[PDB]
């Protein structure tokens, strides 16, 4: 149905996302159990990690377009990422390595992320109708890999340890690289302009020097989140100043602030919603026992099923509004489940968390899939930078918010933790409901501005 390089890109993307989410699903638990962080330290450190992983995505599109070429940067990104995964596996021998290893993943992701999507776009003549379907299959590829990782990585870490789990993440990247190298002939006339000139070693060294610097800067910021906070606060207020000095851009600003709220909520899945499942949900569904950390896999699951369906079925601002109402309902469902539908021992049915993740995933399908695509319809480079900066800030803010659900390591009673989760999830849901209503009210004015 699709060009042959599509299937190569599909499977490179699947395996790279497998590696990434294999780490992400277990990282907060690893912080708590293996490094002895409190839940608060683990949550804010995960927020810092997630912030850097996202903010650095801005680097890989530029490097691929203008410095080394899309295909060269896929190779370099995959190599740095695999090195990062093996470095994380090694951090169990050398605990002092952990932050450097996470910086290597962040920077490696930064170089890699933007480029397979770019490559896929070049596999089709410019107005080919199959483009939309191919990109929906690409998103499904991301989420099949993520589904497998979130399902299996906690089981693997429980049965064989973290060193094995992280080495398998590295192996998944190695197998993405082997499949890419094996299919190189399929994309011989596909690439950005630098792919077809010989590689400039001047630019390659600039990219390696800058990468290593960034790896060390990431390690420092993740170790000292209290200065990551001020770095991003001052960067945010300053870039806000420089956005305000320089009206279709104002729509980009309000949509950016709405996305910030969205990412605050998305950031809870590996932290507060993860530990809520650990502490206050039954670990059995349809009669099978499961690792509650695997509950995170419900997000890609619902995406995998719902992206085709919703592909078959207003315009820009109303889809954002709809997504925000869905996310609000996810957290209100969590709060309601804990408030009214718990056992005498403080535990709630896992079907309530299935529903939380359904709502949350529909919110994702309305918002993050369809955000910067028609933020790109309203707009440049400055707003791309501000976009990534503010969404990284969103992940830091999300870690801070998750700390309101943090449980001391000495608490053992679900009736003590249930009211904490429910108070926080309910207040998140009420604030997000308010935000969705103001979005609804502004939908007509924005939709005029888009004209």
């Amino acid at each position: 149905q699709q060009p042959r390089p599509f299937f190569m890109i599909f499977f490179v993307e699947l395996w790279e996302r497998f590696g990434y989410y294999g780490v992400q699903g277990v990282l907060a638990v690893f912080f708590v159990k293996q490094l002895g962080f409190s839940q608060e330290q683990a949550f804010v450190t995960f927020g810092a990690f997630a912030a850097l992983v996202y903010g650095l995505i801005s680097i890989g599109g530029y490097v691929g377009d203008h410095l080394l070429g899309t295909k060269r940067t896929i190779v370099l990104g995959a190599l740095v990422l695999a090195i990062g995964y093996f470095m994380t596996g090694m951090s169990l021998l050398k605990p002092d390595l952990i932050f450097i290893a996470l910086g290597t993943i962040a920077v490696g992701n930064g170089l890699f992320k933007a480029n397979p999507a770019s490559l896929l776009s070049k596999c089709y003549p410019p107005k080919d109708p199959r483009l939309d379907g191919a990109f929906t299959l690409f998103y499904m590829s991301i989420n099949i890999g993520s589904l497998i990782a979130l399902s299996l990585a906690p089981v693997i870490a429980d049965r064989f340890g973290y060193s094995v789990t992280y080495n398998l993440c590295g192996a998944g990247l190695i197998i993405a690289l082997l499949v890419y190298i094996a299919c190189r002939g399929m994309v011989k006339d596909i690439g950005s302009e630098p792919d077809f000139r010989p590689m400039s070693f001047s630019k390659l060294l600039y990219v390696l020097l800058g990468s290593v610097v960034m790896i060390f800067v990431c390690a420092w910021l993740m170790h000292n989140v209290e200065v990551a906070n001020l770095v991003l606060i001052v960067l945010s207020i300053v870039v806000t100043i420089i956005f305000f000095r320089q009206n279709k851009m104002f729509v980009a600003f309000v949509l950016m602030l709405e996305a910030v709220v969205f990412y605050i909520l998305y950031a809870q899945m590996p932290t507060s919603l993860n530990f809520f499942a650990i502490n206050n949900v039954h670990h059995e569904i349809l009669g099978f026992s499961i690792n509650p950390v695997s509950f995170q896999a419900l997000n890609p699951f619902w995406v995998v099923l719902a992206s085709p369906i919703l592909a078959g079925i207003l315009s820009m601002p109303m889809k954002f509004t709809l997504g925000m109402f869905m996310c609000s309902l996810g957290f209100l469902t969590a709060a309601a489940a804990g408030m009214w539908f718990a056992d005498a021992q403080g535990l709630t049915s896992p079907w309530f968390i299935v529903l939380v993740y359904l709502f949350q995933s529909l919110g994702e399908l309305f918002i993050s899939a369809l955000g910067l695509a028609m933020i790109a319809a309203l707009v440049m480079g400055f707003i791309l930078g501000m976009w990534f900066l503010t969404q990284a800030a969103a992940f830091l803010l999300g870690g801070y918010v998750a700390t309101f659900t943090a449980v001391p390591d000495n608490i053992t009673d679900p009736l003590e933790t249930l009211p904490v989760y429910t108070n926080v999830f309910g207040k998140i849901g009420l604030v997000t409901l308010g935000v969705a209503v103001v979005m609804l009210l502004m939908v007509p004015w924005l939709k005029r501005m888009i004209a």
Partner: nanobody
Amino acid sequence: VQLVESGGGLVQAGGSLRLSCAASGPTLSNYAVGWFRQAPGKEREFVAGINWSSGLRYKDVVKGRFTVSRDNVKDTVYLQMNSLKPEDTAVYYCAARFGGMLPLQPSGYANWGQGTQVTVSS
């Protein structure tokens, strides 16, 4: 996923016994281990437990007599039972639940040992 309990037996009132719980493939380290007991003609009741990060929970009638502890090297959990009394006679079970919580009812725990008889004679 399967726990083996050991160390039960017959003891006189005021004596002591130590139960131990070991798991097979999973690392017990990620688990809260609760000890339950079933006396003749009654339901399983929570006795004592330790979560994955050394938090402890006890039934009121065994406090000051029972101690739960964990040897994370041997991947084993222990119940030290001192000042034993006849009404402590029961089948004892260890149960394991992932994480930091020790719920009071058997339905909170997915993995169960087979049970060890403890008898305390007057």
